Amino acid sequence: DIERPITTGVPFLLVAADARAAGLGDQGVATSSDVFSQQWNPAKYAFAEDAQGLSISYTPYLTDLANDISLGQVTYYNKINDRSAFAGSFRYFGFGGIELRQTGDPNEPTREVNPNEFALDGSYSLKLSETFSMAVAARYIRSNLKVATEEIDASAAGSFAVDVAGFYQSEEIAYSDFNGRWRAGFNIQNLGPKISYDHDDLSANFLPANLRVGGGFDFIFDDYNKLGVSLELTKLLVPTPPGPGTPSQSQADEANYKKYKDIGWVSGIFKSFGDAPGGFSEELKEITYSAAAEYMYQDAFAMRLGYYHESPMKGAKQFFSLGAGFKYSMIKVDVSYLFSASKVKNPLENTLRFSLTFNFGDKYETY
Amino acid sequence: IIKSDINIKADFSLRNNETLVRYLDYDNNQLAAGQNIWSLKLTADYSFSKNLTAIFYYDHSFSKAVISTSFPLTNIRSGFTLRYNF
Amino acid sequence: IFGSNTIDVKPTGSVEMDLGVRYTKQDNPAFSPRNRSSLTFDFDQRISMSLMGKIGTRLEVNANYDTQSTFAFQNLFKLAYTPSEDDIIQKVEVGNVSMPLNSTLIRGAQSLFGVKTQLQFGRTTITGVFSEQKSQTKSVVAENGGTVQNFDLYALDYDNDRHFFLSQYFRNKYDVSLKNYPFIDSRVQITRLEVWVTNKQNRVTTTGGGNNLRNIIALQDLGEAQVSGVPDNEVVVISSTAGFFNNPIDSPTSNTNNKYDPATIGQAGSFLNSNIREIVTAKSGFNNTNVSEATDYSVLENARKLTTNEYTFNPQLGYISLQQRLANDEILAVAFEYTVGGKVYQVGEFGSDGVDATVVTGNNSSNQAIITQSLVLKMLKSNLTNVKNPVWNLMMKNVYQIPQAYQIKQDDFRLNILYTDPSPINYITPVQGSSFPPNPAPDSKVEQTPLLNVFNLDRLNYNNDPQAGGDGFFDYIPGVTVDVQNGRVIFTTKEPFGELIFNKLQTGAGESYNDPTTYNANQQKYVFRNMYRNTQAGALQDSDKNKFLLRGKYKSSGSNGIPIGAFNVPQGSVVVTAAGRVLVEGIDYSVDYQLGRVQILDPSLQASNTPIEVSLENNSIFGQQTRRFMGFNIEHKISDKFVIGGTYLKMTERPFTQKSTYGQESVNNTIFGFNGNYSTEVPFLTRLANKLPNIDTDVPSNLSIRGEVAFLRPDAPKASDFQGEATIYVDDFEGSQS
Amino acid sequence: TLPDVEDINRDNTMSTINAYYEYSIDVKPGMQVGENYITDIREVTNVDLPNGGTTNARWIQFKIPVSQPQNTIGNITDFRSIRFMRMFMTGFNSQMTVRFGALDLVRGEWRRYTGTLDANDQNPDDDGVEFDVAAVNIQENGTKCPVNYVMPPGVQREQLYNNNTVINQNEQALAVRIGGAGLQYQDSRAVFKNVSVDMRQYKKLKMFLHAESLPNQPTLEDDEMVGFIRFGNDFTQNFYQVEIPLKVTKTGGSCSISPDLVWMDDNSIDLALDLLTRMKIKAMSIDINSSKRDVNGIYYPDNDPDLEGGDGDGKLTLGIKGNPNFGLVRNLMVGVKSRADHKDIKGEVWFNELRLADLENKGGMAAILNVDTNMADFATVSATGRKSTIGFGSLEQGANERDREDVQQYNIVTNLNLGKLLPKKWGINLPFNYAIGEEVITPEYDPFNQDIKLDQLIRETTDQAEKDNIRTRAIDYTKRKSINFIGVRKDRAPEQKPHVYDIENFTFSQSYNQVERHDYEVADYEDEQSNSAVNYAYTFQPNFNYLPSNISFNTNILRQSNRQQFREVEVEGIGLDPLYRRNFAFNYQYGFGFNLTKSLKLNYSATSNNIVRNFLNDDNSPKEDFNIWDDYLDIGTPNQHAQQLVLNY
Amino acid sequence: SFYVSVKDKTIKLNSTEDVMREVSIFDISGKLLYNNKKVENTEFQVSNFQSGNQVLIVKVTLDNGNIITKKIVFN
Amino acid sequence: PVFYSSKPSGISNDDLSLNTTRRIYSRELYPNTDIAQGQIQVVNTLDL
Ligand SMILES: CCCCCCCCCCC(CCCCCCCCCC)(CO[C@H]1O[C@@H](CO)[C@H](O[C@@H]2O[C@@H](CO)[C@H](O)[C@@H](O)[C@@H]2O)[C@@H](O)[C@@H]1O)CO[C@H]1O[C@@H](CO)[C@H](O[C@@H]2O[C@@H](CO)[C@H](O)[C@@H](O)[C@@H]2O)[C@@H](O)[C@H]1O
């Protein structure tokens, strides 16, 4: 099963937060530009068709067990020129309100705790050429999951991170049977200082520094039927912890952990490439991939199919995803569902994701 | 360019409770229970459109300790709730 | 691909967003200064959307999303693609789908999420499904309306720490007084009872019966006189009974029975001084020498009086049943008063007749003396458990709680006693090389005697009139053998699996129930003395004795209709089988799907006592493994009245981990089968009917023949396999050591 | 914020009793595992400190068995009321800090078996044997000094997702330690669990075992300690016994030993339950007083000189005492036994992953035939025939829920509209219902012994009377008959004036039900129910008025007859005396409403329950030869009579 | 109506006359920590070491078959 | 935790490096026990 997973702080940052990308196998780095294109590739906000947009996303957790445990996302973008765009997003994971009750009469004033985790990020995307765009994003992450007790301090832990992303979208290219369009993108995510959950420099966790690379092709037939095929590759930019031993018996393990944990995040980013006994063939074992297909009808109905594969030695998250999208006038609705293919219970099994986006403002022509 | 009425609703409450146990034959009035809660709930409506409504809310609650087994508790909830109709 | 290019999927409902801050400050000084206040961000979503519409006259959408909907199955999403009638593909459905089957052996599933495809090749139609099943199959059995609930209780599983004899007198009167039940051979009528327990709630209110807090001293031996068949050491803990008792041997329990009489505290020859009234000097309040703080007495300072809703009591048999069991170090103490004809007896001190709680001398706080005085009560349970003291014997061990039984009635309650060694047999056989006592009394027969008679539970007929060997049924007497309000069964002896069966097996006076070394080797295997002389956990060490089984059933009807134990049942998932035949959903019964009520409409079935089986899907489940439901159904039509079928179904459960513990197994079952349906019209039967004396009908006569064969191929998933073999863990020992 | 009070359990009362158990621990610089209750030591080599330096550290795990107090203060004899815990430090001469990374009371699901297991000693609470049961964890005992805890080969830690974090679950083994004076030659110590396990659908019972010597004690040698499982319905009379001599893991060098040497395959239990069945069938032929039995009464086939092949397992020693049943295991015991004759052995034994393997997944089949016909709105017939074999079931049913029985069943229901045989002018509703059917159920397993298949038991009997008894007592047979006349009435003419004496105001219902059964528990069972009802109702249509506004009346004859003859399972020669329940009742109620005045109003009602006791003798003994129709129109003596009067003014 | 209290890592179920039939306590990972089919309106003792988890989900099945869910903090 | 997270006046880094005062993390006592990220990673020892 899962041998030597990468341990990072705030792992909620890597969860797909919108139904459209979830339905496409948790990938968005090289799909078409959309309102949710901040977690995946902020650089394609410069390629948006509408001037500005707002989105609400709901990803419930443990739906059979409890309500109000969910990951919510609000995104707003505003492309001002034909070349630039501003975007701000807010991802929020919370357990809902929990009342701290110790009986002591059924009218006692009870404290209510709301353990939660959120990331607030803003990005600016600029079109360098007519087909290429870049973006920089700044993110504030705050983790507040623990509940205050005696001898447990529930002070929130925070960190800052930056993202550098690029998006390529070619013009329409006519072929023998169709006039297709190519897409590519990269996103280096969550680059920032380590997050200290216990507010001590000796005990700090790497931010989930992530590299997403992907490409996409759009099969366009009959000028109103689209088949979008996209591929994505993802690698964590965090050093892998030591395993059996690489210098008594436990002394080697403790020394290896000590040398692993005394690694800077900047140096850890470069040490992610390697730091394992295996070669390049076994280095590819740290790469996750996802393949997706999206059929578009009139640009108002979409059907999404996606496969996500994490190498079962790490994480072991393998699933198929189905998604559908509907656009009424200015409102888009997206739902997605996950079919797990791994031994380990996926927390998002048997869960329907829901996304809702509003598009308003002027309309920009696509090149 | 956008005109709407602002509906203000404010609700204040102050509740005092006291349980006393009194001895008849000597001065032994025992404070056995108590509660000294006050709460304030403010709300403010604004219809930005026929479908879009913005509400500001401010809930402030303070419970004072009457006997030492209870701790003073302040609960403040304030923010904006955006509501859209289809 | 779609008929038109119009898209009219329209959203309905609302979306609500909360953006705010939560601030909390609780002034607990024990908290760290770092936890002085909590300032968190508040974000909430309240989506209540609905999506209905059409895409190009071929695609249909019916979606509904509610974040506030309890249970996630109510968030529906259905995509139906219906092409032209000339196409091979007749229907594609994605989302919430169902796979209904017209089969008795192979049931379909109604609560599925996946893809359902229907094809047609001329006259053969193939329906395939691949989905995840969101529901669980549940079955209930109903007779005469109400659902049947079966129960199984071994003798060791009595209702412990809840039922207490008020005195040794009542405990030793119990068996003889119930010899000729329902007639009770006792004139005792408990008229007043006050029950006190250790106060841990420590909450003062005016509404729950007031604020009656008192200091208590509970004496183990209070009010006890000697007993004819029992030596004094199992009646009273007191070290020496010399000069203790002052009433004749078999006197009813009463304060005046011994020298612990609270009315004579410190008079001339009392065993108690006035120091007994004070908590501080409680030990010095005894005149006798060897007195221990948890054996002879127990003290409480702010003992709380139970209200009448926290216990019931049997006024004739002199025992009490608490609402909440005292499974811990709690202290139980009572004062009670009862009549025997014109005679009134009191055993404790009531608040009305006890000493005052407080006496104050002096005029101001500098010279005032506070005397706080305790009520003298009878101890029913001590602070520290000692199974060798007589107070232990006050706890009744002959009361069995029928699980979840609330308002049991006769004709809706069955109970039998069986000996399971290992199979359930309703009689007892002697140890090989021995025999049961010869020439027994008719009430003492054991050989070839049903265990209901052996344990004195069947001497009456249906109308509770005595019948020689019983009627074969448990004697249902609401004040003696059953507690109707709480669903409890009470044996007519205090130790049915101990002394009663010992006596039925006794062959001579050399055998003594209290000396197991004298047992006659039938008593050695059948007498469970330890379940009465030891705690339940202690009795676990006598593993060979817990073989007597209380088995039965009760019917809970309550209101009209069968309660099927589920709510918002999916439509079309309810199957009702009466006597091996499947009933018809519109003729024989009706279903109220929201409340989970099945109403039987066939008049013959309602007046039949025939057990009715109800199968249904319920999606009100949690913590369940993911279930994959896949398969196909072939429905070739041979002619207009002849159709054959080809069902094949597979269901795989996905285990949470690779270790399946016993009870939480995963299945990988496959089922397939074939069906035939031949439905003709027979005008000959109509003509024959018109040949009958006064019949001039013209409705057609139909004949319908249905056959089906099914094959089940079970298995377990490869995920829960250890070293290539399907594995169930009886104990991996990860759940030990809490 | 709480006042200081001399009342710690907050029961308002200050206890002064000093009856408690004493346990003690030495605190000294060089403590080692195996003494002073120390069970594990974890050395920490280089701790990063906030000042930039490093330090050594040593974490010591203690486990103080509560059942082995060093001393007793006052009068306490059991552990049923333990209300307080106290810790205090003494003996130190200077400032001493003790830091508790953990401090717990630990409770286990496995209970030490008190009481003797071998009859040779029969004095368990003596001899100074230290018997401790605990658990060894991968999370807490990876540095255990004699042998580090490792998973058995092939065993993996379970993995779950907490919140986007992979969590490896703990892997634990049950550890039993024998110390003090040690184990006598044939003495044993064991722990037990009360369970409910059906092992009939699996072929193998497996468990990992490990044995090691105690530090500072004489070394344990191979095949001196015997691990055993004892399971069944008890531990003294009805159990299977599975024993295995234990090879001891060699200690003395490094603490880290490979899992293949910690959990030797030679020490693994791999028991085929068919061997248990063979042993039970063979022990059927062994007398309980036979010399082939042990002093405990256990029959060991391996010790039987006249049996070839022993118990069929070369590695395991199998035993059986008194007809246990692995179809319903109520009691599970694991323990250690000694085989060293002139020695007192000490050591530690681990038990891990007790499991069932090799699912018996042969399936089954079922066939259903339905015939439904209607005869021109006069007659309807529905016939059903079902046949299912052992192993069939639903898709959702697990290993122990699928059919362990062959079922043959049919059912015929007929409905006749007998009112159509009379002229439609004077219309009579005369519906007739007739239902018949029976089901035959043959179990896979013989109900006696509960875990031997019926076919195998019949084959291995070699006695015609016993074979016939076994075959017939297993059949579960039910026959049902239903005859109904519910709702008999005459409809009014299309234009007819209602009258008080009209026969149109009456309704008649007759129901008859009969169930005949015989199965493993009852050799003869008959249930008969008859229900006759007559209903009347008439509403009159328009000193004070005396004409009633309405009149109601209904009568009910209810007869229930039960005959139960419980079977003697051993022989079909006599049977128990049959038991009779009879519930012959006669019920009638009448009511009428008045409207004496436009304001006055009177409703009267009376109900009467009569019981018919014609089936009883002069003494309280039932009559066997009393038919349910004997005196049908007999009103008995009154049992309950009620009246109700309602007056509105 | 139904309220759950946790004092000293002891969970107590208090229902206003609603009789409960089964209790299941789940970790935030969805893991079953404690199942009891013999609920007695009483105090359950769940093993106190939960590897840093604080939030538990209590699922209570009543006799009628309804399910009551409460999120608690294991302190 | 105030001694470790926001050092009060008069408390130095040496005062917090003693094996009698230092913060104990679960990884030191339980190296094989996995704690979810953001959950409690410190062992709150009872010190006598
Ligand atoms: C970080 C958060 C940012 C949030 C931005 C909110 C923007 C709200 C603008 C309302 C809006 C967008 C729809 C949003 C609905 C999604 C709400 C989802 C809530 C989920 C819980 C509805 O407009 C649509 O909705 C219909 C509503 O019925 C309208 O009907 C009518 O609606 C009413 C006439 O507008 C009638 O009075 C009503 O009679 C009708 O019915 C239609 O006109 C139209 O289809 C139209 O947007 C337009 O309004 C202007 C006003 O200044 C905004 O100007 C900009 O504002 C800043 C940009 O913010 C910029 O900086 C600023 O430079 C710039 O001046 C632009 O936005 C503009 O494009």
The neighbour count for residue D68, using CB atoms within 10 Å, is 14
State the best of F2, F3, F23, F40 to mutate against chain C, taking most chain C CBs within 10 Å: F2
Q: Is the CB of B49 inside a 6 Å radius of any atom of ligand 1? A: yes
Q: Ligand 1 centre and the CA of B6: distance in Å?
A: 18
User: B: neighbours with 3+ CB pairs under 8 Å?
Assistant: A, C, D
Is D11 in contact with C429 (Cβ distance < 8 A)? no
Q: Ligand 1 centre and the CA of A356: distance in Å?
A: 16
- Check if the beta carbon of residue C393 is closer than 8 Å to that of residue C171: yes
Interface of D with F in 123-142 (CB under 8 A): 138-140, 142
Q: Which residues contact C719 (CB under 8 A, 6 or more apart)?
A: A343, C654, C655, C658, C666
Among C563, C623, C738, the residue with its CB nearest the CB of E32 is C623
- Check if the beta carbon of residue A62 is closer than 8 Å to that of residue E57: yes
- d(Cα D476, Cα D469) in Å, to the nearest integer? 14
Is F38 in contact with A253 (Cβ distance < 8 A)? no
Q: What is the DSSP string of D183-225?
A: E-TT-EEEEEEEEEE--TTEEEEEEEEEEEPPTTSPPPPTTTE
Burial class (CB in 10 A: 0-12, 13-18, 19+), C531: buried
The neighbour count for residue D461, using CB atoms within 10 Å, is 17
Residue C575: which of C98, C107, C96, C73 has the closest Cα? Answer: C107
Provide the residue type at C285 as one letter. G
Among A114, A349, A352, the residue with its CB nearest the CB of C22 is A114
In this complex, does chain F touch chain B, defined as having at least 3 beta-carbon pairs under 8 Å apart?
no
Q: Ligand 1 centre and the CA of B49: distance in Å?
A: 8
- Check if the beta carbon of residue D73 is closer than 8 Å to that of residue C704: no
Q: Ligand 1 centre and the CA of A358: distance in Å?
A: 10
From residue C443, how far is each of A270, C472, C503, C735 by CA, in Å? 91, 14, 11, 48
D559, D562, D563, D564 alpha-carbon torsion, rounded to 10°: -170
Q: What is the DSSP string of A275-299?
A: -SSS-HHHHGGGEEEEEEEEEEETT
Partners of D483 in beta bridges: D434, D512
- Check if the beta carbon of residue D312 is closer than 8 Å to that of residue D273: no
- Check if the beta carbon of residue D82 is closer than 8 Å to that of residue F41: no
Residue with tokens 């892998």: A240
Residue D485: which of D509, D456, D460 has the closest Cα? Answer: D509
Partners of A158 in beta bridges: A142
- Check if the beta carbon of residue A317 is closer than 8 Å to that of residue A346: yes
Q: In the numeric block, which tokens belong to residue D103?
A: 């401090």
Q: Is E1 on the interface with F (CB under 8 A)?
A: no
Output the CA torsion sign for D273, D279, D282, D284. Answer: negative
F4, F6, F11, F14 alpha-carbon torsion, rounded to 10°: 40
- d(Cα D149, Cα D173) in Å, to the nearest integer? 9
- Check if the beta carbon of residue C142 is closer than 8 Å to that of residue C612: yes
Is A105 in contact with C10 (Cβ distance < 8 A)? no
Report the SS3 class of residue C191.
strand
State the best of C14, C15, C45 to mutate against chain A, taking most chain A CBs within 10 Å: C45
- d(Cα C734, Cα D140) in Å, to the nearest integer? 13
Q: In the numeric block, which tokens belong to residue B72?
A: 């003073």
- Check if the beta carbon of residue D108 is closer than 8 Å to that of residue C736: yes
Question: Atom 35 in ligand 1: which residue has the minimum CA distance?
Answer: B49
Question: Where are the extended beta strands (E) located within C352-412?
Answer: 358-361, 369-372, 375-381, 399-401
- d(Cα E7, Cα E2) in Å, to the nearest integer? 17
Among C563, C596, C620, the residue with its CB nearest the CB of E67 is C620
Best of A123, A360, A362, A363 for a ligand 1 pocket test (most atoms within 8 Å of beta carbon): A360
Q: Ligand 1 centre and the CA of A35: distance in Å?
A: 16
Interface of E with C in 13-72 (CB under 8 A): 19, 21, 24, 26, 30-32, 40-42, 45-48, 59, 63-67
Among D161, D165, D255, the residue with its CB nearest the CB of A249 is D255
- Check if the beta carbon of residue C263 is closer than 8 Å to that of residue C254: no
Residue C459: which of C438, C440, C445 has the closest Cα? Answer: C445
F26-45 exposure pattern, b = at least 16 Cβ within 10 A, e = fewer: bbbbbbbbbbbbbbbbbbeb
Task: Give me the phi and psi of A279, to 5 degrees please.
Answer: -90, -160
Q: Is D13 on the interface with C (CB under 8 A)?
A: yes
Residue C194: which of C272, C44, C107, C303 has the closest Cα? Answer: C303
- d(Cα D525, Cα D522) in Å, to the nearest integer? 6
Residue A90: which of A36, A164, A52 has the closest Cα? Answer: A36
In this complex, does chain E touch chain B, defined as having at least 3 beta-carbon pairs under 8 Å apart?
no
Give chain C positions within 8 Å (CB) of F2: 32-34
Between β-strands D476-484 and D506-518, what pairing exists: parallel, antiparallel or unpaired?
Answer: antiparallel
Residue with tokens 């002891």: E10
Q: Where is D590: in which H helix or E strand? A: strand D585-594
Between β-strands D159-161 and D166-168, what pairing exists: parallel, antiparallel or unpaired?
Answer: antiparallel
Provide the residue type at C485 as one letter. Q
> Residue C25, CB half-sphere, CA atoms under 13 Å: how many?
9
Among C463, C712, C729, the residue with its CB nearest the CB of D393 is C712
Give chain A positions within 8 Å (CB) of E73: 98, 100, 113, 147
Task: Give me the phi and psi of D12, to 5 degrees please.
Answer: 75, -5
Q: In what order do the strands lie in the sheet with B30-47?
A: B8-21, B30-47, B52-64, B73-85, C14-26, C38-45
Provide the residue type at C82 as one letter. T
- Check if the beta carbon of residue C498 is closer than 8 Å to that of residue C514: no
Q: What was the elucidation method?
A: cryo-EM
Provide the residue type at C358 as one letter. T
Min Cα separation A244/chain B (Å): 50
Q: Is A300 on the interface with C (CB under 8 A)?
A: yes
Q: In the numeric block, which tokens belong to residue A220?
A: 């366009």
Q: What is the DSSP string of C681-719?
A: E-HHHHHHHHTSTT-------EEEEEEEEEEEE----GG
Residue C298: which of C192, C380, C354 has the closest Cα? Answer: C380
Partners of A301 in beta bridges: A297, A326
Partners of D537 in beta bridges: D552
The neighbour count for residue A80, using CB atoms within 10 Å, is 10
Is D104 in contact with E48 (Cβ distance < 8 A)? yes
Partners of D65 in beta bridges: none
Give chain C positions within 8 Å (CB) of D202: 726, 728
- d(Cα D143, Cα D256) in Å, to the nearest integer? 8
Residue C524: which of C515, C535, C536, C537 has the closest Cα? Answer: C515
Is F41 in contact with E54 (Cβ distance < 8 A)? no
Question: Atom 40 in ligand 1: which residue has the minimum CA distance?
Answer: B49
Residue with tokens 């199957």: C575
Among C467, C543, C713, the residue with its CB nearest the CB of D234 is C543
Q: In the numeric block, which tokens belong to residue D565?
A: 């003859």
Burial class (CB in 10 A: 0-12, 13-18, 19+), C243: exposed
Between β-strands D111-112 and C109-121, what pairing exists: parallel, antiparallel or unpaired?
Answer: unpaired
Of all atoms in ligand 1, which is nearest to the CA of residue A88? 1
From residue A252, how far is each of A4, A242, A256 by CA, in Å? 16, 10, 6
Partners of C371 in beta bridges: C359
Is E73 in contact with A113 (Cβ distance < 8 A)? yes
Q: Is the CB of A58 inside a 6 Å radius of any atom of ligand 1? A: no
Helix then strand then coil, % of chain D, to nearest 5 = 5, 45, 50
Residue C56: which of A358, A224, A49, A357 has the closest Cα? Answer: A224
